[PDB]
Amino acid sequence: ERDMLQKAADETTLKNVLVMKQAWVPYPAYTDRAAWDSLMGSNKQRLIAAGEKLLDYKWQLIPATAYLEYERTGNRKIMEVPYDANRQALNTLMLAELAEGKGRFIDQLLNGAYMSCEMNSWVLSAHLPRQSSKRSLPDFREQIIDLGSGGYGALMAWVHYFFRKPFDKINPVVSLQMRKAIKERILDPYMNDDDMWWMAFNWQPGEIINNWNPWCNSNALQCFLLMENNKDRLAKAVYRSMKSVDKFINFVKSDGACEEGTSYWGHAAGKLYDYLQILSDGTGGKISLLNEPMIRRMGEYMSRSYVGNGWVVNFADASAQGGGDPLLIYRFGKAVNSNEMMHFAAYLLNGRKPYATMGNDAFRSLQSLLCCNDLAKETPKHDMPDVTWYPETEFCYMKNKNGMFVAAKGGFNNESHNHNDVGTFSLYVNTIPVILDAGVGTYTKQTFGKDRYTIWTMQSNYHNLPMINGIPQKYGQEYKATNTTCNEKKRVFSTDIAAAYPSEAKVKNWIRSYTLDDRKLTITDSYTLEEAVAPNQVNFMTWGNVTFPSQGKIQIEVKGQKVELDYPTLFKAELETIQLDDPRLSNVWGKEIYRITLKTNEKKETGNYKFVIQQI
Ligand SMILES: [Zn+2]
């Protein structure tokens, strides 16, 4: 309960600082060719060519049966593919006409606008069932807002903004109808319906708030700034949006870590960024949270979590492969003054020149024009401290100058997209995973619900952890780490994992600690049991070519990198193959990965283990 936005301003403040008549718009007038040419640079010929490919595009109708099919079989794409094709065509035509300015794409822009007004709804078939009737087919008497419609509305709102005058010379009824449509589909419902789930008014402990909140609020805000010219109404809308986005800010951890990982980052933190940018532009910079430390940390998480060559930290149900929109990361970094994020975005270009963002997100497409020149000039660098420590999320990243990156966590077995992974770690060498975290599989019916933890990728058994007295970690809020420390100077992470295990595990304490020096990672386990009932087992997950050249040495060679894992000789080491049937995994790891199991006949109440990993 920080309520940063409500603290920065109330409705009265708003009315005083809002900029009317779209005077906040940062792009040249459509008629201002010279300014368009300077801004566009070599985006110009590129966008013109993209536009030219759409001069005979046939606007796709979406049939009733395409919406009905979501109820019949679960099929989303039958409806979404034509929808998105139309939305991308309209977005591209907008950029091409800005680029050229000779009227050549105006007729297709007009067609696209008009057809969109004729559609009963801009809501995806998969989301329409939130409406009162609970059906997947649009109900012409009612509109809700979803991720799609919000974006559709904002795009239409921008097309109205740039092309009203040429449209009106052709026939003023087109722009009239667009204003009515955006009113019925965005403005009205946004103001009149308090109960949309992603707005999070009336939010209750236990309910979820997620990326839908800053994403939909950012799209709504644009529609208001572009289309609502009554200031009393506008101030009320904007204020409503700040109270709504305050709920998201409130729920997010202050340390800046996105515990869903980097593939939500873009539409989570990145749409919070978008929202604050639009809110700042809309108030002449007077209502801005972009200087807040927390916002900078949310941005930088993308940088710190990105190991290299596509590989990212992937605690929880998250892909080990990752990436980002470099242009967005730049604009975010510039806005919160992170040179790290700006250098990072240039590194993420992989030596390409930055061009306009295409797709269907008007705001991002337009904003990408403003940033291309500067990002093109930025020096590519992925620098960062040796240690990043997120104390509230309990994620610790530690690196050395000879290519080792370790990610470790404390936490609790009820995070978003939870894996039972209190205490785990991941090791990368020159960006390549060497001790890995499997990550996300294809969804089944067992994925949510009891039985979630019957899927192997969610079990502690298949993370880099012990089975204490042969027992794994248990799912649940109070199965958790205690006394997690990170000593940033010495690169020591340490946590007691005992409480993440159930009573059957009969453990008092188990301290799992990671130390990273310039050449090597040392893992230690120091444990006290209530009763020695079964041998403990220690597991490590890996891939490539694994060899066992003597007791207790394992060598791992993968993608050019080579390590040795030194383990206590009381342990017998075995390698189990895990043939990957699931494409969502085999597309990251290939055909198979391995669990190294370490098993003993010894049983005692007290013990410690040391393991050491170094390059060779
Ligand atoms: Zn995992």
Approximately how much helix is present in the residues?
25-40%
Cα distance spanning the termini:
50 Å
| Strand order across the largest sheet | 11-12-13-14-21-18-17-16
Instruction: Give me the count of strands.
Output: 21
Structural class: alpha+beta
Radius of gyration: 27 Å
- How can the largest sheet be summarized? 8 strands, antiparallel
Estimate what percentage of residues fall within beta strands.
Answer: 15-25%
Under CATH, the topology of one domain can be stated as Beta-galactosidase, Chain A, domain 5
The total count of helices amounts to 18
CATH architecture of one domain: Distorted Sandwich
Ligands and ions found: zinc ion
- CATH class of one domain, please? Mainly Beta
Shape: elongated
PDB class: lyase
Keywords: Polysaccharide lyase, glycosaminoglycan, Hyaluronic acid, conformational change, lyase
Assembly: monomeric
Entry title: Polysaccharide lyase BtPL33HA (BT4410) Apo form 2
